[PDB]
Design a binder for this molecule. Structure first.
Ligand SMILES: NC(=O)C1=CN([C@@H]2O[C@H](COP(=O)(O)OP(=O)(O)OC[C@H]3O[C@@H](n4cnc5c(N)ncnc54)[C@H](O)[C@@H]3O)[C@@H](O)[C@H]2O)C=CC1
Ligand SMILES: NC(=O)C1=CN([C@@H]2O[C@H](COP(=O)(O)OP(=O)(O)OC[C@H]3O[C@@H](n4cnc5c(N)ncnc54)[C@H](O)[C@@H]3O)[C@@H](O)[C@H]2O)C=CC1
Ligand SMILES: NC(=O)C1=CN([C@@H]2O[C@H](COP(=O)(O)OP(=O)(O)OC[C@H]3O[C@@H](n4cnc5c(N)ncnc54)[C@H](O)[C@@H]3O)[C@@H](O)[C@H]2O)C=CC1
Lengths: 293, 286, 286, 293
């Protein structure tokens, strides 16, 4: 039952990008055999065999991990003529680490039920540095017994597994954390922009904010990087802004007013428009440029 | 000219509330003689003038621009009682305009005014772990160092006059919008069916919430909004920041949204901690 | 080719609510034979059965999910229409749902016009709707008798998808127009202005739209009988914000308005979306 | 008592810019004698006598009308030995048409009481085209008997006098109306921007929006001008954004949450930063440039 390497050695990835490839390396170290599918056929890992379709990927894996950008990519690869779900055996596990909507999560869970496949919604908190060090925090929705089955996989890629509740709970908890992260950055960029506009020395201001208790450790790391103009993508603007769009849609469906998060989303739209592929913290540089002019 | 206890033993306070009384206690331990004036009435003095006449250094801790003007200016105000060459230290959270007015007025009296607001609330004042954010001349900041060292753990020299007031506004914005962001995000999670205890405990484990805001979240788990920084003062600070950002023509939509949420917070409970917005949002969702 | 009563007398509706019924009254007067399907309950049992006995299909459903439920599959409307026929979608749905339906119609040889309308139940009563239509010029001309009977003006917005997009533009203006007015009134009341003075004064200024002045007059009397319910206005705002995020366009005023309309929907989903005026009055009155 | 041209022919202006000079022409037509003071000594009407100080203006005028940009300009010319109040005679009327804060309004009313001068806060709704046609709406605070005294002056410059309440009521009603105007424009600019970003033809879209009932007559006029790129200053961004700052300060003092107005203010800050002196409707062009990227 437990998906240890002896019981279920073959883990197939649907999607194999910045996070998934780093996850795969820790799973390979833990004793699993890794394979992957991507629409392009390329991936950052040359030694990982590539399968031609999602169906072919699923037909030769014991467990499937999904790590795709959005609802549309998830639907493109799980359903249809060559979709992954129909390639899985009854009683097997699908682990979705993608950041997708509650609706996409419910659709996949239901489709899994029809095929006899248990789908865990297990998005992660942490970016590429945390993927590198296997210090991700797994946010998982599903039955306790199914989370237990996946324990060795979660343990290999992360430092902590939070059982958020039944199916859908992991996806919702991820949306919560994404909103905190996105609005924390827009808040910081706007506050820095006011300080600079009001004449504060840039080097003094960036170093002073490293000393205050009201900024998170994640955002202090972004602020230090931004002092250096370093926006190499850990979490690109295109993905952060998509997560903000998903959160605002979910909050509207629940009829919860979230004006701070809604404002932050618009700032991250501007960030994405100006540079989709650099780190989402580049809004700091955007705001600096506004006040320079 | 350094303002050590042996050189300037008498520190007189204009305003003596939660923060100031805690600062005054730490300056007493450091060896200064504390006096104070408050509108309501440590030895107390009946007027700002009387307070400044019997003090070597004056420290101001008043709520807003209006209180600052009422106690600094005029024949019974603090400046009229001060002597050329002395220092006034304003720790109040006031506008850049009020700061510039007081600096210029101080100059006419031969008094150097340091704008030295602080980061940290009553727990930080209790433990003298405040961060002092001070604007002024390098040598005047040095004159005040023993006072700043008694009440805090770090003095940040932010620049010339007005730089401390501006840096406090920056930090206020981060603090206020950090709270409104957290309240809204928790509200979504609860509205989407997440178990309350699970959600509060999970958020204590993530790296994207500040230590300050994680403390607020733990208190909110218990419905505890006893004031450390009351909604009326946080919302006032947000009003000041948004006024200054408008005068500088800097678009700050996240801070503007947070300000409106803190207006609602103040309306519903002006005196409980500003983190009570967490409760306000829980009640909306419920 | 033209869908006159002579050439295409039978118009079948998918959905038949507040606007679709009023739409049908005018098409009846124009000489068409009206039939309809709704999931509740001349009424036909399925969308398939509806389409089989209609010459033109008009769709008026609340959201993307309802559109997909009734459009697709063996019991869906498309499975029952003939190549060369035309489906007119007047529903307020997403650009994504619009594109999906257009492509599905192509596979069946069916042209899908996205023709949402501007105007509410009073304009549907008087055939005063403005039709906002995307499609080929020749397909739009085919539908002209139908658009002329239900409305006063047909705007050809561009190719397929252009009507859906133009509707989203107009929905943003309508929604944020109301939230702006509700907050401005709220500030006025909180600052002590007489309520009847204030409502009457705003009726006389040139910066409020005729639509919003009619809402303001109704709100003066506390009348929020639904013409456009909060649940549907807030859904339209959700769609617009999703579309604006997909296009990466920053729209802070529209995003703020959406959050106020989420509160409005939560407090009263079925009253007119203008009830936010009352919601804000109650915030100010405590 | 009634301030008709017969009883009180002389009207002196403190400030004489775009609005005040147009008011002056209609008062001249109604049979008043016009004089003015500006700090610069010049005005768009070269046929009107200029006075060197506010004090000198008030000494030779029966009623004084004030039309200055902001609180700071108001205090500079009302107070002190050279100010207008020092030159007015007990029992005369001061009519302030400036858009200033409720605090500045209360200060000037109390100061006028000390001098025996009743101050009416009478800002106006309407811009330069309405001033040209005397279609202004006067929003006046004060006692009904003092409003009645000023009726012939209000009638010559406007089409409707709204008695908003006691002192301070006109200033507050002007703030209400300014917020509707400002956020009406930012709403329209953002909605147009979405439409353009989604591929709608520019000419089609501007013309289509002229046909819908959810845009005000004022903003329809701005939309037509914006199609033409015409942002000649009727109401410059620097003054609109100042008015929004005043409204958001007042709303914060009243603890009233106004998120749509707050969002609009930030958009008008960007507008002012990019072009302070063009019409405030230039945000439409700003947003078009953002989507052109
Ligand atoms: N900091 C981060 O980057 C984190 C990202 N996430 C989430 O994890 C997911 C993956 O993120 P990254 O690896 O950073 O993205 P990425 O852009 O680096 O990788 C995307 C991968 O998915 C593949 N892909 C695209 N469409 C596909 C389809 N239809 N079927 C299968 N594969 C497809 C791409 O070829 C690529 O291998 C996203 O949902 C993201 O929001 C979660 C935690 C943190
Ligand atoms: N002021 C207004 O009410 C206007 C509304 N609209 C849009 O027109 C559409 C309909 O609006 P209203 O008639 O006012 O709404 P409504 O709620 O009064 O009518 C909805 C109708 O659709 C039916 N329906 C529900 N689910 C269905 C499904 N899965 N398949 C088929 N029919 C289904 C319902 O039974 C009902 O007959 C919405 O997209 C709305 O946003 C557009 C213009 C103005
Ligand atoms: N569309 C508009 O332009 C409208 C403007 N208002 C308000 O009316 C006031 C004037 O606006 P505009 O005439 O358009 O501006 P403007 O800039 O054309 O006129 C300003 C006038 O005041 C004078 N001035 C400046 N500082 C002064 C001081 N300290 N003392 C005396 N005069 C001084 C200037 O020399 C000039 O004559 C402002 O408060 C504005 O917000 C009201 C309604 C509409």
């Amino acid at each position: 039952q437990i998906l240890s390497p002896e019981n279920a050695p073959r883990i197939g990835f649907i999607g194999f990008g910045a996070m998934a490839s780093r996850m795969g390396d820790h799973l390979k170290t833990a004793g699993y055999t890794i394979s992957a599918y991507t629409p392009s056929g390329r991936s950052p890992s040359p030694s990982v065999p590539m399968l031609p379709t999602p169906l072919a990927l699923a037909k030769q894996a014991d467990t499937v991990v999904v790590c795709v950008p959005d609802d549309e990519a998830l639907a493109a690869s799980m359903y249809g003529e060559n979709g992954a779900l129909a390639g899985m055996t009854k009683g097997s596990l699908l682990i979705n680490t993608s950041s997708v909507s509650p609706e996409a999560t419910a659709t996949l869970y239901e489709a899994g039920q029809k095929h006899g496949v248990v789908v865990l919604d297990a998005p992660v908190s942490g970016s590429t540095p945390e993927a590198d060090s296997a210090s991700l925090v797994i946010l998982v929705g599903g039955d306790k017994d199914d989370v237990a089955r996946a324990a060795p996989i979660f343990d290999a890629i992360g430092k902590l597994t939070i059982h958020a509740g039944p199916t859908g709970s992991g996806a919702r908890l991820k949306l919560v954390i994404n909103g905190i992260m996105g609005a924390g950055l827009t808040t910081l960029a706007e506050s820095v922009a006011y300080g600079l506009s009001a004449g504060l020395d840039r080097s003094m201001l960036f170093d002073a904010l490293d000393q205050v208790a009201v900024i998170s450790p994640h955002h202090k790391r972004k602020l230090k990087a931004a002092k250096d103009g370093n926006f190499a993508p850990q979490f690109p603007a295109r993905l952060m802004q998509k997560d903000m769009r998903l959160l605002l849609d979910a909050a509207a469906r629940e009829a919860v007013p979230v004006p701070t998060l809604a404002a932050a989303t618009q700032q991250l739209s501007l960030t994405r428009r100006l540079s989709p592929n650099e780190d989402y913290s580049s809004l700091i540089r955007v705001m600096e440029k506004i006040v320079a002019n």
